[PDB]
């Protein structure tokens, strides 16, 4: 049977013009990511800030169509526009936006924002949808008063919970969560993550959980995928990738995570040398300018995803060692 969600060499290239009259550049925003996702699983997506993660999220949620590659849901093409089918498929995949204030319409009370998905997709009446909205709001620790508030009348940790509430309303199959808990205090971060886990175990939701906080994906992930400059660099179960990070970038990534425990702290493995430019990517391997294991092949060829017993890795030193 075909996986719930499948991506095959997804590419997205953005045209950048210096001005109304100027030569056109092409930003390399996603360079052929590939993965499979199944009912009840979390694929955590981690890596550099500015490496393709929200771009991948906008492809997966059908906010944009890719510049090549393929994308499949339950064995049904997403990119081949089927207007008749789109009606049904539309709800089954949902988004939680990064910096979600812009995703909230300034001139509608949050109650209306929350009700809109149910209004469009369900037969719930005017008061029943209110009830629903309140219910959901209460699950994330939003008060009843807020039903009459406007989006400018909130703080960031309320806006994020508003956005989570809107995404998780419809009982989707797939939630593409772009940093869903990045502005929450720990005491309510725990309540939101417990809701996401309750849903995952109850309904069979799957998550593409984009994150920068590794402590959270160490808990919420089944599988973790590491991205650098629009390319995958490592993939496997979070057990494998926490216990034995093989790709040189993932070692430098997991070895800079903050910890509260004084005795669990380590002096970070520092990185130096010029950051690759997503406009003019270096020849061959992206990480070569900063990497400590660099051979000759690094500046000549690009590493594809080789297998080592389920931990997929895209490096040459790893190959050398195997």
């Amino acid at each position: 049977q075909q996986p719930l969600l499948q991506a095959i060499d997804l590419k997205k290239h953005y045209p950048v013009k210096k001005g109304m009259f100027a030569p056109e550049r092409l930003v390399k925003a996603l360079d052929g990511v590939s993965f499979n996702l199944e009912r009840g699983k979390t694929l955590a997506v981690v890596g550099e800030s500015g490496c393709g993660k929200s771009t991948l999220g906008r492809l997966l949620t059908m906010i944009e169509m890719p510049t090549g590659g393929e994308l499949y849901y339950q064995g049904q093409d997403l990119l081949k526009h089927d207007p008749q089918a789109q009606k049904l498929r539309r709800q089954k995949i949902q988004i939680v936006f990064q910096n979600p204030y812009g995703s909230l319409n300034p001139r509608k009370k949050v109650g209306q924002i929350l009700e809109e998905p149910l209004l469009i997709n369900t037969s719930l009446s005017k008061e029943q949808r209110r009830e629903k909205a309140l219910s959901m709001m209460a699950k994330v620790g939003l008060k009843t008063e807020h039903y009459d508030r406007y989006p400018h009348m909130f703080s960031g940790g309320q806006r994020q919970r508003i956005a989570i509430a809107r995404g998780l309303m419809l009982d989707p199959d797939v939630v593409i969560a772009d940093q869903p808990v990045s502005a929450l205090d720990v005491s309510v971060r725990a309540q939101v993550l417990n809701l996401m886990m309750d849903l995952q175990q109850e309904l069979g939701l799957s998550y593409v959980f984009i994150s920068h906080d590794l402590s959270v994906v160490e808990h919420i992930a089944d599988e973790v995928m590491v991205m650098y400059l629009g390319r995958c660099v490592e993939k496997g179960t979070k057990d494998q990738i926490f216990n034995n990070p093989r790709h040189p970038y993932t070692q430098a990534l997991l070895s800079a995570t903050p910890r509260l425990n004084p005795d669990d702290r380590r002096e970070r493995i520092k990185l130096s040398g010029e950051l690759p430019s997503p406009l003019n990517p270096p020849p061959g391997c992206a990480f070569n300018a900063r990497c400590r294991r660099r051979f000759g092949p690094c500046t000549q060829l690009q590493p594809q995803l080789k297998d080592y017993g389920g931990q997929l890795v895209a490096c040459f030193a790893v190959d050398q060692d195997e």
Binding site: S49, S54, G156, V186, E218, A256, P258
Partner: protein, 324 residues
């Protein structure tokens, strides 16, 4: 002190039933001092910072007993002069970087305004200094990214860009309203080390607001804990997380991922922050606190000062082992 706050209160809504979004907070910041602010989302941390900046508009109102910066009083000095003062010597990182930036200018102009205003350089210096700043901040391609509009940045680039122009300000006091939120750890460390480098080099003060504790445990000198609009705890950074005095900080630290196995349901403090229509008299934590006595219900605790130099807004401060 460089900043002093005797009392501060911001209300929202009409006078018959005001939302008390900030309620009689008080703190001080010394020159070269790093102060962390932590605690529940909704507790007034951004509004407390905005009210010092003077960035509160019609639907809200600012009450203070005294509010001082650099030896001048922000209520006795006129608007024409108090705006010049706070804007010249104070800078702020805002919480959402995408809406904080102007949608109709290039990032180079956006940063080169602040460099012109606060350091007076010529056109070629302003270019080079925005390249240098975006470089040091960790921008993939400084030379090309100046010409990029704020909608073509993604979130964690726009955040570094505004940290960049805020550092260009050369502030006496920077308020960092979550400077790390949309940044990967490997870069988080570069941001925090940069800020703490500044803080050392230039005697710069820093008010750092975070939802994540380990950063401020390492970085901060002094920590202020805010809950439901008021300061619930204060003291030395290191001390605080080792030995919590207020039941709120104890219930904040016990919820962290370090204290559960993978895929267990995490611990939390149940209930919700007080509204304007269900706000209980006495201690606001009353409904949620597990140690709530009748004095907690009847009387609002003073900001009590302990013998170890710390402060906690509690009738029965916790011992070094976990009990009142």
């Amino acid at each position: 002190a460089l900043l002093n706050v005797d009392k501060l209160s911001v209300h929202f809504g009409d006078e018959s039933a005001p939302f008390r979004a900030v309620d009689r907070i008080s703190y001080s910041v010394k020159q070269g001092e790093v102060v962390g602010i932590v605690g529940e989302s909704g507790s007034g941390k951004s509004v407390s910072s905005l009210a010092i900046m003077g960035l509160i508009d019609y639907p809200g109102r600012v009450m203070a007993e005294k509010l001082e910066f650099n030896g001048q009083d922000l209520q006795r000095i006129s608007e024409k002069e108090r705006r010049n003062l706070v804007g010249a010597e104070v800078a702020m990182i805002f919480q959402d970087p995408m809406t904080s930036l102007n949608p109709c200018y290039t990032v180079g102009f956006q940063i080169m305004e602040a460099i012109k205003v606060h350091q007076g350089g010529n056109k070629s210096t302003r270019r080079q200094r925005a390249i240098d700043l975006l470089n040091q901040v960790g921008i993939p391609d400084p030379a090309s990214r100046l010409d990029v509009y704020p909608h073509q940045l993604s979130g964690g680039m726009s955040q570094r860009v505004m940290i960049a122009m805020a550092i260009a300000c050369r502030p006496k006091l920077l308020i960092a309203d979550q400077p790390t939120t949309a940044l990967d750890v490997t870069i988080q460390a570069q941001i925090i080390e940069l800020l703490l480098e500044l803080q050392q080099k230039e005697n710069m003060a820093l008010v750092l607001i975070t939802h994540d504790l380990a950063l401020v445990a390492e970085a901060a000198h002094k920590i202020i804990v805010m809950y439901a609009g008021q300061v619930v705890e204060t003291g030395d950074a290191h001390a605080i997380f080792h030995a919590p005095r207020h039941p709120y900080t104890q219930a904040l630290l016990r919820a962290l991922p370090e204290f559960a196995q993978d895929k267990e349901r995490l611990a939390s403090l149940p209930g919700v922050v007080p509204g304007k229509y269900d706000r209980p008299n006495g201690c606001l934590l009353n409904p949620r606190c597990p140690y709530a006595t009748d004095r907690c219900r009847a009387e609002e605790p003073a900001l009590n000062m302990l013998a170890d130099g710390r402060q906690s807004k509690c009738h029965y401060p916790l011992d070094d082992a976990g009990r009142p």
